[PDB]
Each structure stands twice: as structure tokens, then as C-alpha cells.
Amino acid sequence: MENFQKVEKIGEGTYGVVYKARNKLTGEVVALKKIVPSTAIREISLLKELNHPNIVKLLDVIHTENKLYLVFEFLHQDLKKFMDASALTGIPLPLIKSYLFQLLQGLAFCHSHRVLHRDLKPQNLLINTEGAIKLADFGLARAFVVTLWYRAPEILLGCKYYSTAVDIWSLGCIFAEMVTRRALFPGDSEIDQLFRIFRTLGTPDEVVWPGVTSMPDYKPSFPKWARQDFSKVVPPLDEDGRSLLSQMLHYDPNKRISAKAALAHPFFQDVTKPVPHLRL
């Protein structure tokens, strides 16, 4: 590991501290994450082959002194900071739509390889100066302070075998947040998270989500809220954007739109790739 000089700490992630670091041989600047079960080693090693331009590149996996360091390509800014910096005027819709489109490409890729993220959130969506956005920490949750805001309702209801659909749900919540400049469901506990979802989208029932009532953490005592209309939930998003968001936020994970079908949605008919103006 001595092959790296830490330049600065970027922050505490779910799986360890992330450092900006410089390779002493190569000269390259990278993100260095200090995270050992052989099972974790093999899953992580699979992730090195999972290469896509909207997926932060895992450069190296350093198992040393019984410790695990992951070396990634480095990006200069995350979507949370960019959202914060954009909050006076909001992110312009064409850049929201570009970001959403690119992230759906990323998902479509990983999902087609049966790999899910499970913990999408603004802090692991990384952006560069060329107008790209990338998913960071893909596949780590499986290979191995906690924000709940982007958690799919089937996870909160105790489903142990959830699907790629959970990422679509997270990404729908992020889409909404870019548009409105506020978190869609900022729960501060699991029940607060669930009940915020219920209050906006309606308490789910057997009609809209067959099997919901048989889920591990479902309680017949849940209060029954009525669904709100999306026009009230994410103005001033147009009809195509609301329609797509609605399909990303379907309760039933089987009805929820796939990343691949989302890419064909009419919302993306006029998609472009703007460059943001970023201050590094």
C-alpha cells in the first residue's frame, strides 16, 4: 500500500474512509477506499470486470496485511455538492435529464449482469467537467449514520430477496430531488421512511401490490393514507417526467419500470448532453 500518498480525506463512506491519493509509481491520482472473508475477495474481483462509462472504474483491489483497499478512478465532485451549489436556480432540466439518462445506462448495464447497487444516493453519484455522471460503490453492498431516504419500500418491509428494482426506486427518488431541490422522502428512521412514502404515494394494499400484506414487516395496523397526485409531488416537472417518475416509483417491484425500458421512455426523446459549469 506504500505505493500511495494520501492527498486528502474525502469523507466517511458506508464501507470505509475514501481518500484522494496519488500513485508514487504511475503518477495517477485515484480514490483510495480502505474497507477478510474469501467470499468478499471473489465478489470484489468480479466487480473489476464490470466496466461501463457511467460506472466509476475500479482500478485495483489491494488485499494486503489482511486488509482491503479498493483503488478507483477519481472524480472531482458528487451530485450532493452539485445540487447544493445549484440550489438557487436548480439544475437545468436538460442536465437533469442527461444525468438521469446516463445513470439509467449505468443501471441497465449492471442489471443485465445481475449486479445491483442497493445503496444509491447523491453522495455516490460522481460528476466530471465533461458532463458525465457515474455510479460509485456499485456491487459493494453484496460483496459485503446510515441514510434511508432512497430505500425501496420492499427493503423497508423486510423482503430479503429484493431485485434490481430497488435501484430504480432509489434513482426515482434522486430524480425527484434534483427537480424539486428537496429530498423526496427524508425519513430519519425506518418507520418514518415508510410512512413518508405511504403519505405521498398512498399506503400500499393488495390491489396495487399483490403480496404486500404478507411481507415480513408489514402490519395491518399501518395507517391508511391516500395517494397524492404527482403534479403536487414534483412540480414543475412536465408530464413525460412525471409519467416516468411514477413508473420508477411503483410499489410493486414487478410493475416498477426496468432501467432498459426507462431509457425508451418518451421523456428521453430530446435528451442531450449539456456540460455543467462546475467549480472545483
Ligand SMILES: NS(=O)(=O)c1ccc(NC(=O)c2n[nH]c3ccccc23)cc1
Ligand atoms: N464532496 S465533493 O463534492 O468535493 C467530492 C465528492 C466525491 C469525490 N470523489 C470521490 O469520493 C470518489 N471518486 N471516485 C470514487 C470511487 C469510489 C468512491 C468514491 C469516489 C470528490 C469530491
